[PDB]
């Protein structure tokens, strides 16, 4: 049922409704979680970084979905204005974040939670908002795959 939540871009949107379930993970699957903010903040200010990496996020997702079909990974996106519980649980203080949860150890499955499970974090800064190569390499190393991201020469 979880796998079928993927939109046409192959990305699953976290909601306040499905979050309690999704945060419990899927056995064997990595969780790639983009934590963002697509609207304005309370101050009425946009998040240019969120918007920029969003496109980088999807490009790399598409590449991996196409070149690593066997790969046990799930791509998620959560907006901090839409899922306040995830914001509290994850003690979020800013955006955007990109974190990757490895699958829980089988013997420790029932104790898996986005909130308490260790994760890799890809450092998001304006300097790499659009570097699909570097982000691609990041995931390829974690997922143990070899990919080629379109970037010309």
UniProtKB/Swiss-Prot annotation:
UniProt KW Transmembrane keyword: yes
Kindly list the places in or outside the cell where this protein is found, as annotated in its UniProt entry: Endoplasmic reticulum membrane
Protein origin, superkingdom? Eukaryota
The yes or no answer to whether the keyword Transmembrane helix is present is: yes
**What happens when you mutate residue 47 to S?**
Alters glycosyltransferase efficiency towards a subset of target proteins
Q: Enumerate the UniProt keywords alphabetically.
A: Disulfide bond, Endoplasmic reticulum, Membrane, Signal, Transmembrane, Transmembrane helix
Broad class of where this protein is predominantly found: endoplasmic reticulum
Q: Which cysteines are joined by disulfide bonds?
A: 47-50
Q: What does this protein do?
A: Subunit of the oligosaccharyl transferase (OST) complex that catalyzes the initial transfer of a defined glycan (Glc(3)Man(9)GlcNAc(2) in eukaryotes) from the lipid carrier dolichol-pyrophosphate to an asparagine residue within an Asn-X-Ser/Thr consensus motif in nascent polypeptide chains, the first step in protein N-glycosylation. N-glycosylation occurs cotranslationally and the complex associates with the Sec61 complex at the channel-forming translocon complex that mediates protein translocation across the endoplasmic reticulum (ER). All subunits are required for a maximal enzyme activity.
Similarity comment? Belongs to the OST3/OST6 family.
Q: Tell me more from the record.
A: Present with 1080 molecules/cell in log phase SD medium.
- The molecule here is called Dolichyl-diphosphooligosaccharide--protein glycosyltransferase subunit OST6
Question: What is the scientific name of the source organism?
Answer: Saccharomyces cerevisiae (strain ATCC 204508 / S288c) (Baker's yeast)
Q: What is the lineage of its organism?
A: Eukaryota, Fungi, Dikarya, Ascomycota, Saccharomycotina
Q: From which residue to which, out of the full length, is covered?
A: 32 to 184 of 332
């Amino acid at each position: 049922d979880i796998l079928q939540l993927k939109d046409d871009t192959g990305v699953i949107t976290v909601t306040a409704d499905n979050y309690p379930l999704l945060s419990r993970g899927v056995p064997g699957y990595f969780n790639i979680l983009y934590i963002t903010m697509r609207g304005t903040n309370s101050n009425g200010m946009s998040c240019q970084l969120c918007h920029d990496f969003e496109k980088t996020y999807h490009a790399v997702a598409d590449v991996i979905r196409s070149q690593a079909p066997q790969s046990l990974n799930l791509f998620f996106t959560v907006d901090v204005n839409e899922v306040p519980q995830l914001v509290k649980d994850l003690k979020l203080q800013n955006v955007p974040h990109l974190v990757v949860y490895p699958p829980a150890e089988s013997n420790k499955q029932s104790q898996f939670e986005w909130k308490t499970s260790p994760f890799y974090q890809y450092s998001l800064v304006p300097e790499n908002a659009e570097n699909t190569l570097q982000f691609g390499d990041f995931l390829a190393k974690i997922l143990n795959i070899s990919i080629t991201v379109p970037q010309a020469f």
